[PDB]
Amino acid sequence: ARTVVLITGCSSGIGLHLAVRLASDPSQSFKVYATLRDLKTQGRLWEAARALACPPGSLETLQLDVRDSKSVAAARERVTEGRVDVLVCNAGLGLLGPLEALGEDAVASVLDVNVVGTVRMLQAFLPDMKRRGSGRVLVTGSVGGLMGLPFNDVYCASKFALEGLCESLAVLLLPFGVHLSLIECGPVHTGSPEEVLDRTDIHTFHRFYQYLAHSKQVFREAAQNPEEVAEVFLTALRAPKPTLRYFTTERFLPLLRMRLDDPSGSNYVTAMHREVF
Amino acid sequence: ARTVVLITGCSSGIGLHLAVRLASDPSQSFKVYATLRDLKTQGRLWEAARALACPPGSLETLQLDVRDSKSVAAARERVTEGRVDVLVCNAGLGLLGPLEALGEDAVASVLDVNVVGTVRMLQAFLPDMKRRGSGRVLVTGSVGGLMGLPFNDVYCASKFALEGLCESLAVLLLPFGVHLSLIECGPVHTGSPEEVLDRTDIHTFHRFYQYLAHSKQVFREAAQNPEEVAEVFLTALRAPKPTLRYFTTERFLPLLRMRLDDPSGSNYVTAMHREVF
Ligand SMILES: C[C@]12CCC(=O)C[C@@H]1CC[C@@H]1[C@@H]2CC[C@]2(C)[C@@H](O)CC[C@@H]12
Ligand SMILES: C[C@]12CCC(=O)C[C@@H]1CC[C@@H]1[C@@H]2CC[C@]2(C)[C@@H](O)CC[C@@H]12
């Protein structure tokens, strides 16, 4: 009857706002499983759910740790309807800093949550979709998945990885009737200094500050409401033939095109260096 | 005096051929540390070294496991010259199959060797390069880093990740005088069926066969000599101002451009589906 949606990473941000947008939809078309790594963070989702007056039974929370394939399987068994019509792979971690200041565990964690975590969800959920010959997968992407950003080396690695993962899968899934799309987000309004200085050189440290200053100004001028981003997920959801990629904004497309039409990377690296520094 | 080169993944392929090309250079400009995960595989490198008559002391082998930051640090201490002029990040794993048939450990291993392994090398070696204000980093890339290939979902994820990692770093390293370049390789002439069938559906299994058939024909028609690929690394090495990206072939550039100029991904996914299936 209803469209069953399971969303990862609902404790804040896009995931939180998408979950309550869908559950509160005036048409009541959606049953939403909002999943979270730590149940102690669920308060914010329930406060938003109340604000939007989600009908009882339109929204349920599950604990799901995308690092643990047992946790993934336990949450899938909790989908009482026995299918997922829309899977939204949104859990993700950022990681910001000079590459040599990043702990090895932090690097592996970002990769595990952002890439392997999405692999675990797709392994768990794609089979029943392929069998039914139907289902929609939406994956939260980033501008940092489409072009490299300084001091985001590992975050960008992880978001570029989701691009390759999803594009590869889409080439195969086409004749199966299962549609996968990336939702490419720019900024969204959702170590300490001594720590970082201890792990890098003064010149890199200064470039980091410059990057942070520029980033803050891009964010204050350009950040989108998660309400507006969530509606782009909805657009993808309802598209009779969805495309592989949706963009939540036109903002970064000129930078992207400059990347796109000089494959040597020389124009992009130059332009981004000037843009930031 | 000599240009000190440390290359990862020298047991076969590009890494093996690049190592002996450099060590055997008639000019004797290069001292090469060819590194390998398992020393039992070093025979092939030494057979090639003899064939090309590398002078004694032009080539040394080190054991290096890019999964282990202690192994990385132990090999760096073995660079008797106390600097690395050229770091070649080439170790890599493939992974081929229906996504749901891939073991979780195999997925994590590919990511660890191909992405985190390269992060470990850059963390270990970039600091002294930035300090000197000089050094060249060359990273073995792939066509699968630039466009998604069906049944290579995790391999492509890993090779897309190297793109984001390197591009992000290049934006920063520009004013430091340290130059990083990807060398984008097409095919290079360097589970059992019951296993895979047990882990997927018959229809995906059949698409896998089709992909393998097409792949084999692309390889037989298009595979390059690693001798020819190694010379593209040399070109990058010697370029007074290197670009971010070198391509070893023009072959896949029409497919890439079609990807590049439809950001929605719709033309690429369609064209690649038709190309393979
Ligand atoms: C990381 C930031 C800033 C913080 C964030 O939420 C993600 C966002 C993605 C767009 C980036 C931006 C930093 C400034 C950049 C790099 C602009 O120059 C162009 C794209 C911007
Ligand atoms: C994985 C393969 C085949 C095996 C290999 O060594 C890597 C190589 C990269 C180019 C791929 C190719 C498979 C066939 C493809 C997908 C062609 O259609 C275009 C690019 C090709």
Indicate which atom in ligand 1 lies nearest the CA of residue A276. Answer: 18
Helix then strand then coil, % of chain A, to nearest 5: 55, 15, 30
Minimal CA separation from B52 to chain A, in Å: 32
As to burial, measured by CB atoms within 10 angstroms (0-12 exposed, 13-18 middle, 19+ buried), residue A270 is middle
Q: Which of residues 95-154 of A touch B (CB under 8 A)?
A: 99-100, 102, 104, 107-108, 111-112, 115-116, 119-120, 122-123, 126-127, 130-131, 144-145, 147-154
**Binding-site positions of A for NADP(+):** 9-37, 65, 159
CB contact A240 to B (< 8 Å):
no
Q: How far apart are CA B115 and CA A161, in angstroms?
A: 10
Tokens coding A162:
């989701």
Q: How far apart are CA A152 and CA B169, in angstroms?
A: 9
Contact of A159 with A141, CB cutoff 8 Å: yes
Q: What is the largest CA-CA distance in chain A?
A: 60
Nearest CA in chain B to A168: B148
Instruction: Inspect the interface and report whether the beta carbons of A148 and B170 lie closer than 8 Å.
Output: yes
A227's enclosing H/E stretch is helix A226-238
Quickly list DSSP for A126-174. Answer: HHHHHHHT-EEEEEEEEGGGTS--TT-HHHHHHHHHHHHHHHHHHHHHG
3-state DSSP call for residue A252?
Answer: coil
Residue B31's region, left for phi above 0, alpha for psi from -120 to 50, else beta, is beta
**Rounded CA separation A11/A16 (Å):** 6
* Token reading at A134: 């139907």
Nearest CA in chain B to A272: B171
Pairing state between β A30-36 and A59-63: parallel
Give the H or E element holding residue A70: helix A69-77
| A253 CA: distance to closest CA in chain B (Å) | 9
**Residues A76, A162: Cα–Cα separation, whole Å:** 22
Interrupted after residues, chain B (C–N over 2.5 Å):
190
Contact A263, A200 (CB under 8 A): no
Given CB atoms, is A223 within the 8 Å cutoff of chain B? no
**Rg, C-alpha atoms of chain B:** 19
Q: Which pairs with CB-CB distance under 8 Å and at least 24 residues apart come from A262-267?
A: A263/B245, A263/B247, A263/B253, A263/B256, A263/B260, A264/B243, A264/B244, A264/B245, A264/B246, A265/B167, A265/B170, A265/B182, A265/B243, A265/B244, A265/B245, A266/B243, A266/B244
Q: Is the CB of B209 under 6 A from ligand 2?
A: no
DSSP collapsed to 3 states, chain B = CCEEEEECCCCCHHHHHHHHHHHHCCCCCEEEEEEECCHHHCHHHHHHHHHCCCCCCCEEEEECCCCCHHHHHHHHHCCCCCCCCEEEECCCCCCCCCHHHCCHHHHHHHHHHHHHHHHHHHHHHHHHHHHHCCEEEEEEEEHHHCCCCCCCHHHHHHHHHHHHHHHHHHHHHHHHCEEEEEEEECCECCCCHHHHHCCCCHHHHHHHHHHHHHHHHHHHHHCECHHHHHHHHHHHHHCCCCCCEEECCCCCHHHHHHHHCCCCCHHHHHHHHHHHC
Helices A13-24 and A226-238: crossing angle in degrees, nearest 10, is 60
> How far, in Å, CA of B167 to CA of A11, rounded?
31
User: Which domain range does residue A206 map to?
Assistant: 1-277
> Distance between CA A138 and CA A27 in Å, rounded?
21
Using the Cβ of B239 and the Cβ atoms of chain A, whether some distance falls under 8 Å is answered with: no
| Ligand 2 pocket mutation pick from B158, B183, B190, B215 by most atoms within 8 angstroms of CB | B215
Residues 6+ apart with CB under 8 A from A141: A159, A162, A163, A182, A183, A184, A185, A245
Flag whether residue B161 sits within 8 Å of chain A, measured between CB atoms. yes
- Domain at A71, CATH number: 3.40.50.720
Question: Under an 8 A CB cutoff, do B263 and A253 touch?
Answer: yes
Q: CB distance B99–A107 less than 8 Å?
A: no
Residue type, A244: L
CA distance A240 to chain B (A): 14
A168: nearest CB among B148, B172, B245: B148
Which residues does B213 contact at the CB level (< 8 Å), separation at least 6? none
Number of domains in chain B: 1
Residue A103, classed as helix, strand or coil, is: coil
Residues in Cβ contact with B259 at an 8 Å cutoff, skipping those fewer than 6 apart: B146, B147, B265, B267, B268
What is the three-class DSSP state of A37? coil
Residue in B closest to A111 by C-alpha: B111
Q: d(Cα B160, Cα A57) in Å, to the nearest integer?
A: 41
Experimental determination approach used? X-ray
What spatial distance separates the first Cα and last Cα of chain B, rounded to whole Å? Answer: 54
Binding annotation of A for substrate: 142
* Radius of gyration in angstroms for the set of CA atoms belonging to chain A, rounded to a whole number: 19
Which ligand has the shortest distance to the CA of A254?
A: 1
Phi–psi pair at B209, nearest 5 degrees: -65, -45
A248 touches chain B (CB under 8 A): no
* Residue A5, H or E segment: strand A3-7
Output the residue whose Cα is nearest ligand 2's atom 12.
B215
Q: Name the residue type at position B209.
A: Y
Residue whose CA lies nearest to ligand 1 atom number 12: A215
A142 CA to middle of ligand 1, Å?
A: 9
Are B212 and B193 a contacting pair, CB within 8 Å? no
Touching check for A234 and chain B: CB below 8 Å? no
Of all protein residues, the one whose alpha carbon is nearest to atom 13 of ligand 2 is B215
Q: What is the DSSP letter of A264?
A: T
